[PDB]
Swiss-Prot record:
SUPFAM superfamilies per UniProt: WD40 repeat-like
GO MF assignments: protein folding chaperone
Protein name: 26S proteasome regulatory subunit RPN14
InterPro entries linked to this entry: WD40/YVTN_repeat-like_dom_sf (IPR015943), WD40_repeat_dom_sf (IPR036322), WD40_rpt (IPR001680), WD_repeat_multifunction (IPR051179)
Functional summary from the UniProt entry: Acts as a regulatory subunit of the 26 proteasome which is involved in the ATP-dependent degradation of ubiquitinated proteins. Is not a genuine component of the 26S proteasome, but an auxiliary factor that interacts with the proteasomal ATPase of 19S regulatory particle (RP). Acts as a chaperone which regulates the highly structured assembly of the 19S regulatory particle. Involved in the substrate specificity of the 26S proteasome and is especially involved in the degradation of ubiquitinated GCN4. May contribute to the stability of the 26S proteasome in some stress conditions.
S-S bonds: none
Keyword Cytoplasm: yes
Signal peptide range: none
Gene Ontology CC terms, in alphabetical order: cytoplasm; cytosol; nucleus; proteasome complex
Pfam families linked to this entry: WD40 (PF00400)
Length: 416
């Protein structure tokens, strides 16, 4: 089954190189990774020597849209998508570890840092509010509530905090985890939220009083840390809409919800948020940590999981025994993040790889399929992506925002 995704890195400033238009044979490189030990360096000569291009025998490089370039090198195809907006341009220096966006009241972005700070930005990426020392320690995750009026943060300080956007106040603090909180999921409008921790647990909170109302874990592996969770509405043979289930105390909209968890063991577990049962376990086929996972936004039978050794797997939850797709991305270096948006999978790998993989499905959404032979690379200056965020647009199919260390905050268009 297993396929390889061939990774390429284009020289960051290739546009400036194209633009110098002088007499002396200038080049830029595209490096294609074979394995942990081999990089194929392609010298693209700007030989059309201002903007014609010598890619060598049987190879091609061409501009195909405003911020989009295409290459064929040694029998493999590559797309390169360039930054449309450097969101970091006027931001004071920080290492970003978390990001989210909201549309509603007004377009905003929130960034969290290694130092426990939260920055609230407007639509121009200008600072509206900085919450200094929101936590004592690194912000691991940030989510806007659907209202856009509040946000929730998680930290290595073992806590989550809810913040008002209006006044930067901190009306709730969720205390109970015994190690780093690594992820957050908001249930419906967010009267309940879920958190995950390296302490091995997922906690279901009620935000009204800030208490934990349930703790989920692996029954035979209670201290198996959780790196990543996703919340989804279950597919089943009954209509949830006409349910006559009673409400659980202090639970709001849990009926029909499942939380899927990626563990340090590499096992992935699914819990029914309403009934509390562990319903599925996906085995640690790749014998290393599942660092990140995400649910297919069009078909919740499918999940995508990234592992510490560079395996990206697609799992069908109805067939927990074996993945339905396996793709190596620089085997031996970790997948840091996987994120589904706009019919595509965004993947952060190793020290500086960021990939958009198109997912194609048939008219029935019958089983999403990863377009592994035609990856698009989100071009950066060897920047590490900590987190992705989808930004909707009324005027296009939207953008993706990447953040990371060394004041990295970069916006990309998802159409040309």
């Amino acid at each position: 089954m297993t396929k390889t995704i061939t990774v390429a890195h284009i020289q960051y400033d290739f546009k400036a190189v194209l633009e110098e238009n002088d007499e002396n044979d200038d080049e830029f490189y595209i490096n294609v990774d074979k394995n942990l030990n081999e990089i194929k360096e392609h010298k693209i000569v700007v030989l059309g020597n201002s903007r014609g291009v010598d890619a060598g025998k049987g190879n091609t490089f061409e501009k195909v849209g405003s911020h989009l370039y295409k290459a064929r090198l040694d029998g493999h195809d590559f797309l390169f998508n360039t930054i449309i907006r450097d969101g970091s341009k006027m931001l004071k220096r920080a290492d970003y570890t978390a990001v989210d966006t909201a549309k509603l009241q007004m377009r905003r972005f929130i960034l969290g840092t290694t130092e426990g700070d939260i920055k609230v930005l407007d639509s121009n990426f200008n600072l509206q509010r900085e919450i200094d020392q929101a936590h004592v320690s690194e912000i691991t995750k940030l989510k806007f509530f659907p209202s856009g009026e509040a946000l929730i943060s998680s930290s290595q300080d073992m806590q989550l905090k809810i913040w008002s956007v209006k006044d930067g106040s901190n009306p709730r603090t969720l205390i109970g985890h015994r190690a780093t909180v690594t992820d957050i999921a908001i249930i419906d409008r967010g009267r309940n939220v879920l958190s995950a921790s390296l302490d091995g647990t997922i906690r279901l909170w009620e935000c009204g009083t800030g208490t934990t109302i349930h703790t989920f874990n692996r029954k035979e592996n209670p201290h198996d840390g959780v790196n990543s969770i996703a919340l989804f509405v279950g597919t089943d043979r009954q209509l949830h809409e006409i349910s006559t289930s009673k409400k659980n105390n202090l639970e709001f909209g849990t009926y029909g919800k499942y939380v899927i968890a990626g563990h340090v063991s590499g096992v992935i577990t699914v819990h029914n948020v309403f009934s509390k049962e562990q319903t599925i376990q996906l085995p640690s086929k790749f014998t290393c940590s599942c660092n990140s996972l995400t649910v297919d936004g069009n078909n919740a039978n499918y999940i995508y999981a990234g592992y510490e050794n560079g395996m990206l797997a697609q799992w069908d939850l109805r067939s927990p025994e074996c993945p339905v797709g396996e793709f190596l991305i620089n085997e031996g270096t970790p997948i840091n993040n996987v994120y589904f948006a706009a019919g595509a999978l965004f993947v952060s790998s190793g020290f500086d790889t960021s990939i958009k993989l198109d997912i194609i499905s048939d008219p029935e959404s019958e089983r999403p399929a990863i377009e592994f032979e035609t990856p698009t690379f989100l071009v950066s200056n060897d920047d590490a992506v900590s987190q992705f965020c989808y930004v909707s647009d009324d005027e296009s199919n939207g953008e993706v925002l990447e953040v990371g260390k060394n004041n990295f905050c970069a916006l990309y268009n998802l159409s040309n």
